[PDB]
Scaffold this motif. Structure first.
Motif, PDB file in Angstrom:
ATOM      1  N   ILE A 175      30.282  50.173  40.753  1.00  0.00           N
ATOM      2  CA  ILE A 175      29.859  49.072  41.607  1.00  0.00           C
ATOM      3  C   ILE A 175      30.864  47.936  41.476  1.00  0.00           C
ATOM      4  O   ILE A 175      31.103  47.432  40.373  1.00  0.00           O
ATOM      5  N   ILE A 176      31.449  47.537  42.597  1.00  0.00           N
ATOM      6  CA  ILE A 176      32.316  46.370  42.672  1.00  0.00           C
ATOM      7  C   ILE A 176      31.501  45.270  43.334  1.00  0.00           C
ATOM      8  O   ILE A 176      31.154  45.370  44.514  1.00  0.00           O
ATOM      9  N   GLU A 177      31.190  44.217  42.589  1.00  0.00           N
ATOM     10  CA  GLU A 177      30.309  43.160  43.066  1.00  0.00           C
ATOM     11  C   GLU A 177      31.149  42.009  43.607  1.00  0.00           C
ATOM     12  O   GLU A 177      32.010  41.479  42.899  1.00  0.00           O
ATOM     13  N   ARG A 178      30.893  41.630  44.855  1.00  0.00           N
ATOM     14  CA  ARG A 178      31.604  40.547  45.520  1.00  0.00           C
ATOM     15  C   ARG A 178      30.651  39.377  45.716  1.00  0.00           C
ATOM     16  O   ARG A 178      29.546  39.553  46.239  1.00  0.00           O
ATOM     17  N   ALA A 221      42.063  42.505  49.243  1.00  0.00           N
ATOM     18  CA  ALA A 221      42.658  41.871  48.075  1.00  0.00           C
ATOM     19  C   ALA A 221      41.585  41.374  47.120  1.00  0.00           C
ATOM     20  O   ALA A 221      41.690  41.561  45.905  1.00  0.00           O
ATOM     21  N   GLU A 222      40.540  40.740  47.651  1.00  0.00           N
ATOM     22  CA  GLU A 222      39.446  40.300  46.787  1.00  0.00           C
ATOM     23  C   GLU A 222      38.795  41.487  46.088  1.00  0.00           C
ATOM     24  O   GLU A 222      38.568  41.468  44.869  1.00  0.00           O
ATOM     25  N   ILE A 223      38.495  42.541  46.848  1.00  0.00           N
ATOM     26  CA  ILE A 223      37.848  43.713  46.269  1.00  0.00           C
ATOM     27  C   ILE A 223      38.736  44.334  45.203  1.00  0.00           C
ATOM     28  O   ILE A 223      38.260  44.744  44.142  1.00  0.00           O
ATOM     29  N   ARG A 224      40.037  44.417  45.469  1.00  0.00           N
ATOM     30  CA  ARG A 224      40.957  45.028  44.523  1.00  0.00           C
ATOM     31  C   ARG A 224      41.108  44.182  43.271  1.00  0.00           C
ATOM     32  O   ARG A 224      41.284  44.723  42.177  1.00  0.00           O
ATOM     33  N   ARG A 225      41.055  42.860  43.408  1.00  0.00           N
ATOM     34  CA  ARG A 225      41.093  42.004  42.231  1.00  0.00           C
ATOM     35  C   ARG A 225      39.856  42.215  41.370  1.00  0.00           C
ATOM     36  O   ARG A 225      39.950  42.278  40.137  1.00  0.00           O
TER      37      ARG A 225
END
Ligand SMILES: [Mg+2]
Ligand SMILES: [Mg+2]
Ligand SMILES: [Mg+2]
Ligand SMILES: [Mg+2]
Ligand SMILES: [Mg+2]
Ligand SMILES: [Mg+2]
Ligand SMILES: [Mg+2]
Ligand SMILES: [Mg+2]
Ligand SMILES: [Mg+2]
Ligand SMILES: [Mg+2]
Ligand SMILES: [Mg+2]
Ligand SMILES: [Mg+2]
Ligand SMILES: [Mg+2]
Ligand SMILES: [Mg+2]
Ligand SMILES: [Mg+2]
Ligand SMILES: [Mg+2]
Ligand SMILES: [Mg+2]
Ligand SMILES: [Mg+2]
Ligand SMILES: [Mg+2]
Ligand SMILES: [Mg+2]
Ligand SMILES: [Mg+2]
Ligand SMILES: [Mg+2]
Ligand SMILES: [Mg+2]
Ligand SMILES: [Mg+2]
Ligand SMILES: [Zn+2]
Lengths: 48, 45, 108, 152
Positions: free
Chosen positions: C96-99, C57-61
RNA sequence: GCUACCUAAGAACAGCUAAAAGAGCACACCCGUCUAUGUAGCAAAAUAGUGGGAAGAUUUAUAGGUAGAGGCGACAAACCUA
RNA sequence: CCUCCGCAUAAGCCUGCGUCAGAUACUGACAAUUAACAGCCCAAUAUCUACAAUCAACCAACAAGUCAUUAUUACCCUCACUGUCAACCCAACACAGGCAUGCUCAUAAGGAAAGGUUAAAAAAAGUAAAAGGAACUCGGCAAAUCUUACCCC
RNA sequence: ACCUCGAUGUUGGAUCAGGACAUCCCGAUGGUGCAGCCGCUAUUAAAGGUUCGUUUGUUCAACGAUUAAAGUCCUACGUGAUCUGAGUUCAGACCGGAGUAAUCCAGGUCGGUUUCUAUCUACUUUAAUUCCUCCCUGUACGAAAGGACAAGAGAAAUAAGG
C-alpha cells in the motif's frame, strides 16, 4: 530450486553502493592475506 | 613543438631582469632611467 | 575552393525565402478535451501528461520512502490508496502506497 | 543500403546499443513507466516483451534465469520479473507494453516516448480515446449496422 | 627560463637473458624510422599505429656561465625565445 | 563503460566551480590556508680530515669517488617571521602538446567516447572474406605473418 | 617571344575518359606477282573492341605468354581544388672530374612537407560485339605440302541491364 543471483551492488558502476562494494573487495583481499606482512602492506600501501 | 619557450622560475626572473641586476651595470641603470622617463609603472621585473 | 564573387542579396533572398526553407504550417494541432490546452493529435497532451508525471513523482517518492533503500524492490504488486480510502479484497496482499491527498478524478 | 535491417544503430557500437537498451529496460522493470527518446523506446519495446515472456517461462528455467540475470542490471528486479510481472501477464499472450509519443524534449527537442507495462500501479496515462459512439458519424454507422443486421 | 656547449651539486632507469659489457629482449623515460590522418589542424610540427635507444658518449629537475665584428657546435653553415 | 591515470611534494600561477544575492566555470558581497611539515641558521683563531659506493661481507675493479674533528677562547637569560586555498602551470584558448620527483602498478583514487534521429554518397579508423598469393607498386608502401641468403656504405 | 612571373603546378603511372580517322581487329567492296591457307594494296566504315606480365621512374624499346587486335593521334604532351611522386628540380652527403678555394658538373648515387570546407558554370538513371568447337571437310583448291569458304549446330568471353 530457483537460484536467484545475489542482490548486491555492481562492483564496477559509478555509485555509492558500487564504491562500497569495491571497498569490500579490498577488505576481502586483506582478509585473504595470510602473512601479517602482507596484511600490513595491503592496509598501508595507498598513501593519502 | 615550439611556443613554450617561457619556463617560468622566479629565481631566474629576478636574477636576469631584477632591480639589482639592472643597477649593477651602467647600461641597466640607463634602462631603468629610460623606463622612468617613459613613465612605465614597472621599471624592473 | 573559395567564392569567386559575392552573392547578391537578391540571390540570397531567393535561396533563403524559397518555400523549401520556410517553416511549414502544422494542421495536426487540436484542443485537448480534458484540459483544453493545445496538443498534436498523435502526441500526448503536454498539460495532462505533466499532471500524470507529477502525480507519478509523488507516488514514486512515497514508494522510495517505504522501500527505505536501494535494491529493495518488492516481490508483490502495489496499490496506491488516497485519503479516505481503504484496501479492498484485491488490494489485500499488495504493498500500500498512501498518498496524503484526495484521489484525483482522472486517477481511478 | 539498409534493406531489411531491423535494428537501429545506437550508442558506440553493438555492445553499447545492447547496454543502453539494457539500462532502459532495467529502468522500465523497476518503475513500470519510463520516458526516453522515441527511437530508443521503440528499440527496447521488443526486449521488454521478450523479458515478460522469459519471466513467464518461470524461475526454475535456467535459460530464463540467465537471460533475466543478464538483462536486469539490478538483481533485485529478477524476483520482481518472475513473481510480479509474469504472473500479472499470465493471462495475456502479448502486448504487455504501451508506448506513446510525448512532447519533444525541452533540451534538444528530441522525439520522446513513454513506455509502460500495462496494469501498473502508477496513474493512468492520458490515453488517446476514439470518438464516442454517440457522435453524428458513429450514430449513422450504427444505423447502417442495424439495417444490415435486420436485412440478415 | 627555448636551444648549442659547459660548471656546481642532485635524481631516474621495472622485469627477463647474461655477467663487472658505450652487452641482448623489453617497461618507465628519451628519440622520431615508415605509414595514415591533419594542413586556419587538437597542434604556428600534433594524433594513431609502427619503430631506434633504454647502465650510458644515457635521460632529466635546479642554479650559474659563454652574446652577435660574437657565442656554442660529435660542421648540419646546426642552435643562440616559434 | 573507461582508467592513459590518480594522490601528494617541487616548480609555476595567485583566489581562478566555497556560501549568499543578482544576473544571464559570470558579476558584487561574505568567508578562508592556524605548525609540528618546509623555508628562514651557525662566534672567533688556528688545527685536523690516505683507506669510495655497490645489503660491504667475500670477490672484482676503474672512470678513483656526496658525507669525520680537535685545541683554546666566548656564550643562554628568551619557540619569532614566512608558504599552507583552487578544478591551478608553459603553449594567444576548458589547446588531443610540454611538464621533475615519491607512492599507488590498477587502483579504495579519478573519469564519460553517444545533443536527438536516419543509417545516402565520398572520406577516416577497424573487423571478416570464396579461389589465387606480390600477378599491385618505383619499391611488399600498408596490412598480414615471424620468416632464408648474397651484396655496397 | 604574342597572353600568363601581385604563380597558367611539370615527366611517367592510377581514375575516368571526350574526339579525329590518316582503320590495328570486326563489316562491305576493287585489284593482286589472288590456285587454297596466309597475305599485300586501295575504297567505304569510328557502332563496338583494341591483354597480362619480367627488368627499367620511364613514356617507349627489348623480352615472355597471348589475342581477332594488342592502331596512329588530339584533348594545357586530356585529366595533381581526384590520387601517386619512382625520375627530374632546393636545403644534407659520397664517388669521378674542374678550381687555390668558395663552389661547380648536360655525370652518377642515397634522402628529401602534394594545402584547399565548392560561391558560380557544367554535370549527376539516354536493339552488343567477338572468339572458338563440330560439321561442311581433309571437301573446293593444289604436284605435293598444306587447305578454305558460305549454310547449319553448339559453346563460351567480354559489355549493358538485373
Ligand atoms: Mg627547461
Ligand atoms: Mg550515433
Ligand atoms: Mg634494467
Ligand atoms: Mg645496451
Ligand atoms: Mg658540410
Ligand atoms: Mg652546405
Ligand atoms: Mg560525451
Ligand atoms: Mg551526432
Ligand atoms: Mg581472401
Ligand atoms: Mg611486379
Ligand atoms: Mg616471394
Ligand atoms: Mg604491373
Ligand atoms: Mg612494412
Ligand atoms: Mg611576350
Ligand atoms: Mg618584337
Ligand atoms: Mg591573379
Ligand atoms: Mg577512311
Ligand atoms: Mg607538345
Ligand atoms: Mg622523387
Ligand atoms: Mg670530390
Ligand atoms: Mg632520388
Ligand atoms: Mg628514410
Ligand atoms: Mg592533393
Ligand atoms: Mg569536395
Ligand atoms: Zn490535456
Amino acid at each position: 530450486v530457483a537460484r536467484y543471483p545475489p542482490i548486491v551492488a555492481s562492483m564496477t558502476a559509478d555509485s555509492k553502493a558500487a564504491r562500497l562494494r569495491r571497498i569490500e573487495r579490498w577488505q576481502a583481499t586483506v582478509h585473504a592475506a595470510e602473512s601479517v606482512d602482507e596484511k600490513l602492506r595491503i592496509l598501508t600501501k595507498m598513501q593519502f | 613543438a615550439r611556443g613554450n619557450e617561457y619556463q617560468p622560475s622566479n629565481i631566474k626572473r629576478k636574477n636576469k631582469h631584477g632591480w639589482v641586476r639592472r643597477l649593477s651595470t651602467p647600461a641597466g641603470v640607463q634602462v631603468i632611467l629610460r623606463r622612468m622617463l617613459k613613465g612605465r609603472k614597472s621599471l624592473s621585473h | 575552393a573559395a567564392p569567386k564573387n559575392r552573392r547578391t542579396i537578391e540571390v540570397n533572398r531567393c535561396r533563403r525565402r524559397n518555400p523549401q526553407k520556410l517553416i511549414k504550417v502544422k494542421n495536426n494541432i487540436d484542443v485537448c478535451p480534458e484540459c483544453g490546452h493545445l496538443k498534436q493529435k498523435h502526441v500526448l497532451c503536454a498539460y495532462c501528461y505533466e499532471k500524470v508525471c507529477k502525480e507519478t513523482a509523488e507516488i514514486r517518492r512515497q514508494i522510495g520512502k517505504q522501500e527505505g533503500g536501494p535494491f529493495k524492490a518488492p516481490t508483490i504488486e502495489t496499490v496506491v490508496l488516497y485519503t479516505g480510502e481503504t484496501p479492498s479484497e484485491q488490494d489485500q496482499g499488495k504493498r500500500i502506497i498512501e498518498r496524503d491527498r484526495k484521489r484525483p478524478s482522472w486517477f481511478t | 543500403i539498409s534493406h531489411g535491417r531491423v535494428f537501429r544503430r545506437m550508442g558506440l557500437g553493438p555492445e553499447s546499443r545492447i547496454h543502453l537498451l539494457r539500462n532502459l529496460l532495467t529502468g522500465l522493470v523497476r518503475h513500470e513507466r519510463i520516458e526516453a527518446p522515441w527511437a530508443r523506446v521503440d528499440e527496447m519495446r521488443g526486449y521488454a516483451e521478450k523479458l515478460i515472456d522469459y519471466g513467464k517461462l518461470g524461475d526454475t528455467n535456467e535459460r530464463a534465469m540467465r537471460m533475466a540475470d543478464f538483462w536486469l542490471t539490478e538483481k533485485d528486479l529478477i524476483p520482481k520479473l518472475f513473481q510480479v510481472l509474469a504472473p500479472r501477464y499470465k493471462d495475456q499472450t502479448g502486448g504487455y507494453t504501451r508506448m506513446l509519443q510525448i512532447p519533444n524534449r525541452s533540451l534538444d527537442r528530441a522525439k520522446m516516448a513513454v513506455i509502460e507495462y500495462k496494469g501498473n500501479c502508477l496513474p493512468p496515462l492520458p490515453l488517446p480515446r476514439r470518438d464516442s459512439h454517440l457522435t453524428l458519424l458513429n450514430q449513422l454507422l450504427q444505423g447502417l449496422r442495424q439495417d444490415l443486421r435486420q436485412s440478415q
